[PDB]
């Protein structure tokens, strides 16, 4: 599924991402925009054999199991396919765990380059939340 910006903002808000671990809603919407362009089915092969999955491009080397990333870890305890759903529950739950594993939102380079420090409220303006 491909979400419109405000549609995603509402879903993320309902799932408790607003100010989660210190990151306001816009940060999450912005991250989604630059990682997958709001597409739940985005996948991306990496040189090391891993693949990034879903709306937040969660990696199979540590977080989910896809059966094809030799010597990886499944820390979200989830098949990577659960991350390609229309229902972002699986993606959101796993992202909450990644952000808690020390790093903050630094796991997403696109967030660090395109969102961090900017006016993130722009991503939620015009939406009725």
From Swiss-Prot:
Gene Ontology MF term list: beta-N-acetylglucosaminidase activity; identical protein binding; lysozyme activity
Documented EC number(s): 3.2.1.17
GO cellular component, one term: extracellular space
Top-level class of the enzyme under EC nomenclature: hydrolase
InterPro entries assigned to the protein according to its UniProt record, in alphabetical order: Glyco_hydro_22, Glyco_hydro_22_CS, Glyco_hydro_22_lys, Lysozyme-like_dom_sf
Residues engaged in binding substrate: 101
Function comment: Lysozymes have primarily a bacteriolytic function; those in tissues and body fluids are associated with the monocyte-macrophage system and enhance the activity of immunoagents. Has bacteriolytic activity against M.luteus.
Keyword match Transcription: no
Domain of life: Eukaryota
Active site residues according to the UniProt entry: 35, 52
Family, as annotated: Belongs to the glycosyl hydrolase 22 family.
Coiled coil: none
Pfam families with a match to the protein in the record: Lys
Tissue specificity annotation: In the egg white and polymorphonuclear leukocytes.
S-S bonds: 6-127, 30-115, 64-80, 76-94
Record SMART domains: LYZ1
Note: Lysozyme C is capable of both hydrolysis and transglycosylation; it also shows a slight esterase activity. It acts rapidly on both peptide-substituted and unsubstituted peptidoglycan, and slowly on chitin oligosaccharides.
Main location: secreted
Subunit structure, as described in the record: Monomer.
Catalyzed chemical reaction(s): Hydrolysis of (1->4)-beta-linkages between N-acetylmuramic acid and N-acetyl-D-glucosamine residues in a peptidoglycan and between N-acetyl-D-glucosamine residues in chitodextrins
Keywords annotated in UniProt: Allergen, Antimicrobial, Bacteriolytic enzyme, Disulfide bond, Glycosidase, Hydrolase, Secreted, Signal
Protein name, UniProt field: Lysozyme C
SUPFAM superfamilies referenced in this protein's UniProt entry, alphabetically: Lysozyme-like (SSF53955)
């Amino acid at each position: 599924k491909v979400f419109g910006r405000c549609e995603l903002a509402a879903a993320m808000k309902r799932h408790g991402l607003d100010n989660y671990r210190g990151y306001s809603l816009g940060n999450w919407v912005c991250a989604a925009k630059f990682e997958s362009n709001f597409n739940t089915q985005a996948t991306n092969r990496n040189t090391d054999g891993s693949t990034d999955y879903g709306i937040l491009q969660i990696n199979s080397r540590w977080w989910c199991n896809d059966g094809r990333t030799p010597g990886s870890r499944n820390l979200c305890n989830i098949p990577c396919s659960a991350l390609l759903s229309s229902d972002i529950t699986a993606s959101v739950n796993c992202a909450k765990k990644i952000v808690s594993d020390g790093n903050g939102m630094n796991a997403w380079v696109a967030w660090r380059n395109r969102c961090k420090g900017t006016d993130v409220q722009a991503w939620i303006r015009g939406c009725r939340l």
